[PDB]
Ligand binder design. Structure first.
Ligand SMILES: NS(=O)(=O)/N=C(\Oc1ccccc1)N1CCOCC1
Ligand SMILES: [Zn+2]
Length: 255
């Protein structure tokens, strides 16, 4: 699977029939249908002891991986019951600034979207968590093009070294706190992974406030390759799934 005409989102349902499921992601967030929910508790992003390990081009995106052997970087609160450990983050982005995000807001597409993936520690390990309807929590953050995001620059700086599928590099001592906007105001809804196997295990928490990144930063994302070394170059761009049917779901606002 991939993002091209012959292996892209329109084809995924043949190997992963859940692609046409009842709680697929992403979705369009219609701000006039989302309802404030005063029962939501404050979101707690606890990343002070985060332990990043490595950055990997997996042919679909680049992934910054963390040590999730212990409660070191966790998400709690909000719509969540319990504790969810950060395992990795990645981005989706476009070929041009007017597309790239997976979620949309009143049909607006942002230039890119950051996903911080967390699993529910009550299930012991990630593999067990993704067999549960509350196994994962993904914090989604939109990127727009404006001023540079200083906290993103160390990421941008290493991409030269993982240009092709299968390449990795040490990426210790990275602080993901530097990727957040000021506000933790969010929308939440039950959904899925947005990549095969498209498992319907995720509590989505999508921040309302985008972060700004510079044109130079996003241009460096677009120099990555989907292909492996020595293979013909296919630029890693437009690695986003479009909005899926909302079906019988409710999107709730924390604000
Ligand atoms: N939006 S997402 O489904 O989280 N994307 C991904 O799914 C996962 C699956 C497991 C752990 C973290 C993320 N990625 C990024 C692209 O390469 C495939 C893996
Ligand atoms: Zn993602």
């Amino acid at each position: 699977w991939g993002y091209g005409k012959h292996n892209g989102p329109e084809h995924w349902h043949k190997d992963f029939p859940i692609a046409k499921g009842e709680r697929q992601s992403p979705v369009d967030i219609d701000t006039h249908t989302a309802k404030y929910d005063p029962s939501l508790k404050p979101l707690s992003v606890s990343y002070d002891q985060a332990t990043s390990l490595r950055i990997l081009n997996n042919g679909h995106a680049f992934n910054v991986e963390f040590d999730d052997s212990q409660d070191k970087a966790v998400l709690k609160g909000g719509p969540l019951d319990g504790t969810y450990r950060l395992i990795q983050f990645h981005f989706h982005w476009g070929s041009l600034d007017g597309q790239g995000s997976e979620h949309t807001v009143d049909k607006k597409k942002y230039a890119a979207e950051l996903h911080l993936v967390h699993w529910n520690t009550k299930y012991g390990d990630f593999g067990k968590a993704v067999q549960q309807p509350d196994g994962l929590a993904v914090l989604g953050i939109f990127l727009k093009v404006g001023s540079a995001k200083p906290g993103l620059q160390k990421v941008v700086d290493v991409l030269d070294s993982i240009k092709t599928k299968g390449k990795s590099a040490d990426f210790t001592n990275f602080d993901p706190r530097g990727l957040l906007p000021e506000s933790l105001d969010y929308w939440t809804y039950p959904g899925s992974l947005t990549t095969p196997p498209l498992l319907e295990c995720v509590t989505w928490i999508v921040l309302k406030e985008p972060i700004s990144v510079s044109s130079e930063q996003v241009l460096k994302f677009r120099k990555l390759n989907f292909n492996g070394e020595g293979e013909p170059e296919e630029l890693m761009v437009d690695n986003w799934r479009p909005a899926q049917p909302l079906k019988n779901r409710q999107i709730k606002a924390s604000f």
